[PDB]
Design a protein around this ligand. Structure first.
Ligand SMILES: CNC(=O)[C@H](Cc1ccc(OC)cc1)NC(=O)[C@@H](CC(=O)NO)CC(C)C
Ligand SMILES: CNC(=O)[C@H](Cc1ccc(OC)cc1)NC(=O)[C@@H](CC(=O)NO)CC(C)C
Ligand SMILES: [Ca+2]
Ligand SMILES: [Ca+2]
Ligand SMILES: [Ca+2]
Ligand SMILES: [Ca+2]
Ligand SMILES: [Ca+2]
Ligand SMILES: [Ca+2]
Ligand SMILES: [Ca+2]
Ligand SMILES: [Ca+2]
Ligand SMILES: [Zn+2]
Ligand SMILES: [Zn+2]
Ligand SMILES: [Zn+2]
Ligand SMILES: [Zn+2]
Lengths: 367, 367
């Protein structure tokens, strides 16, 4: 997070605000909620309260404009520059203007008003752009399926107005820290010569030649793929990748999900009803079998046929010796299998059934 | 169109080019075609030829970069700034760099490489930003479902290199000219207190308080709605709008198309097989009937039931006296019906069945 230079903050924490004019793109009530919801998220985590008015001045005047509207910052027409706001102060301070040449929407479609309103307000309250890719106060429009504050937006505003507003103190999603040594993973698949590490809403891409990891949203990379992946594996020859969440899985062939693919793990793979979700999975390309890890059970699956090999709910402890009782994520690189659990990973030699080395979870991260 | 100051143009019309490096987002061949297709569209309409190479320099070096890459224009990470290029000249002249922090896609999804490559190249060849909303050389990313050159991009490049490359001289879509007095319409529906005029890929919005018309893409406004609409009408009480193309129609309730709606005019409305498409349509809210215009036949349709009123393929000439043999577009405002045909429109009094005044098609356009 970054606080605006000179530290402009509203001297009282309760403010008025007023929607001077409405966009013909949305009904009045729809424009009425994009705004209060935008205001709402800054309240939930600090002591700011807000009263909407319909006459006279208010601290935060909100207008839909376009082109030159006389404030030494004219808009640019359709796209590009969407909106802007002014830091705490009298007159124009706190004011937010949105570009009417934009199609203001109520869904994922280009230029969700709610998404833009939450950005501009953090300004109106004293905040500047965050370098955090997941923060709503990042500088560019990236819509992700909802509009929620990450931990960064929260620390920025509480750094000006202190905490509160849900005295069961609020927590917001923290964007993954690549070199933070307490970092653990949800899933990991090797993917066409690179490694795709998954965590919450984020993917950490690396390996093939990267001067550092690339952090960004799962949803900016792929269409259907959920957040909170549980396992993700790859089948190279079928130029294919699979993702798992709860009892469902999506298969993807380069850039998009295969025909009618969010499907069932129980129907497609043959799992007991007790199997409410999986923990990791790896296509062992030598033997042509995928291993699914469920708590402390390793299932082997004849990929080429769907033949769950003879019974197979086995003890990981007897199958893959020395790694433990559970797995976080696993992949196969250079022939080895990299088994993850917490912050430690084990280099396993599948052929001699013995751990060769123990390394950190972050070793591939150029840290 | 706008030509770059100092008029930088490549002194020979055949150029080499080379893709120094490829994006892991797309296979090599997919990155190979976004580029040649991008180059291709500038060829089709001028005398420029291009040879792709794989070693040594070339006039147009193309690289995927990110951040500071040392040219006094560093990228900004994910979103915002997507790419940039340099005018005709030695060394860096003609060179195009694309931001790798962008998810490079092969479809409508955010940041289609083909769409961006066509923009940057017009630069490499000597062009600057057009104020034409429909031009690929407009300054902001607006993807519309394809990547085609409008008439503006064409006139700009032929203004530097003269015509040719399909000696059946190419033509490209001209963006509607609001006040050009030779302008005619495809369809027109009044829409919640404003008027939506349709033409090709574009909508011209006006009326309720507008200090001029708003020109932009049909596809930036609505999801499913085709280009080349034939008729569009509204049913206010059902807060609903309908669009027509060939033998199909979409119904829309505020911002998106109703459930499973691209449907059949013959199935839904009861039209003879001879009815391959319609010309205009208007919900006459007084009588509760919609009139469909087909060549020189007016059909009346009991909207509240789907009862095509008794036979009804009638003579427009006897139904709506004095307007003619065909209609371009029609709507109902202030009780009157505004009948369009070419560049002239007729104010009709539905109750006295007589034209009150004749005006231009552009009269509502603040021209
Ligand atoms: C898809 N478009 C974008 O992502 C543009 C990129 C851009 C930024 C600035 C600009 O001219 C200064 C031109 C283009 N970003 C914006 O509109 C941001 C403007 C801003 O920071 N408001 O406080 C608002 C977003 C973050 C909600
Ligand atoms: C969704 N994003 C956008 O529309 C941004 C908006 C923007 C522009 C400039 C900028 O910093 C200068 C920051 C943001 N446009 C761009 O990337 C254009 C850059 C350009 O003109 N290349 O020749 C390329 C498009 C037209 C294909
Ligand atoms: Ca103010
Ligand atoms: Ca804009
Ligand atoms: Ca608008
Ligand atoms: Ca897991
Ligand atoms: Ca060059
Ligand atoms: Ca960028
Ligand atoms: Ca990329
Ligand atoms: Ca028509
Ligand atoms: Zn402004
Ligand atoms: Zn901003
Ligand atoms: Zn550059
Ligand atoms: Zn440009």
């Amino acid at each position: 997070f970054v606080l605006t230079p000179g530290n402009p903050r509203w001297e009282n924490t309760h403010l008025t605000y007023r929607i001077e004019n409405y966009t013909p793109d949305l009904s009045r009530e729809d424009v009425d909620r994009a705004i209060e919801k935008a205001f709402q998220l800054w309240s939930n985590v600090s002591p700011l309260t807000f009263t909407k008015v319909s006459e006279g001045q208010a601290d935060i005047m909100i207008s839909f404009v376009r082109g030159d509207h006389r404030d030494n910052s004219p808009f640019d027409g359709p796209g590009g520059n969407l909106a802007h706001a002014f830091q705490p102060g009298p007159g124009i301070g706190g004011d937010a203007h949105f570009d009417e040449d934009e199609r203001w929407t109520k869904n994922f479609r280009d230029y969700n008003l709610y998404r833009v309103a939450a950005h501009e307000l953090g300004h109106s309250l004293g905040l500047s752009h965050s370098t955090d890719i997941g923060a709503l106060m990042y500088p560019n429009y990236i819509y992700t399926g909802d509009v929620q504050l990450s931990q960064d937006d929260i620390d920025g505003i509480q750094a000006i107005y202190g905490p509160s507003e849900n005295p069961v103190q609020p927590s917001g999603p923290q964007t993954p820290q690549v070199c933070d040594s307490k970092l653990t993973f949800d899933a990991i698949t090797t993917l066409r010569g690179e490694l795709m590490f998954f965590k919450d809403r984020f993917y950490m891409r690396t390996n093939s030649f990267y001067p550092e990891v690339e952090l960004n949203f799962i949803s900016v990379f792929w269409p259907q793929v959920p957040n909170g992946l549980q396992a993700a594996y790859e089948i190279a020859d079928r130029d294919e990748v699979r993702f798992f969440k709860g009892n469902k899985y999506w298969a993807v062939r380069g850039q998009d999900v295969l025909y009618g693919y969010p499907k069932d793990i129980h129907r497609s793979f043959g799992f007991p009803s007790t199997v409410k979700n999986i923990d990791a999975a790896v296509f062992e390309e030598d033997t042509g079998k995928t291993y699914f890890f469920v708590a402390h059970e390793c299932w082997r699956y004849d990929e080429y046929k769907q033949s769950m090999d003879t019974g197979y709910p086995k003890m990981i402890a007897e199958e893959f010796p020395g790694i433990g009782n559970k797995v976080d994520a696993v992949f196969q690189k250079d022939g080895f299998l990299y088994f993850f659990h917490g912050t430690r990973q084990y280099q396993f030699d599948f052929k001699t059934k013995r751990i060769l080395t123990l390394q950190k979870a972050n070793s591939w991260f150029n840290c």
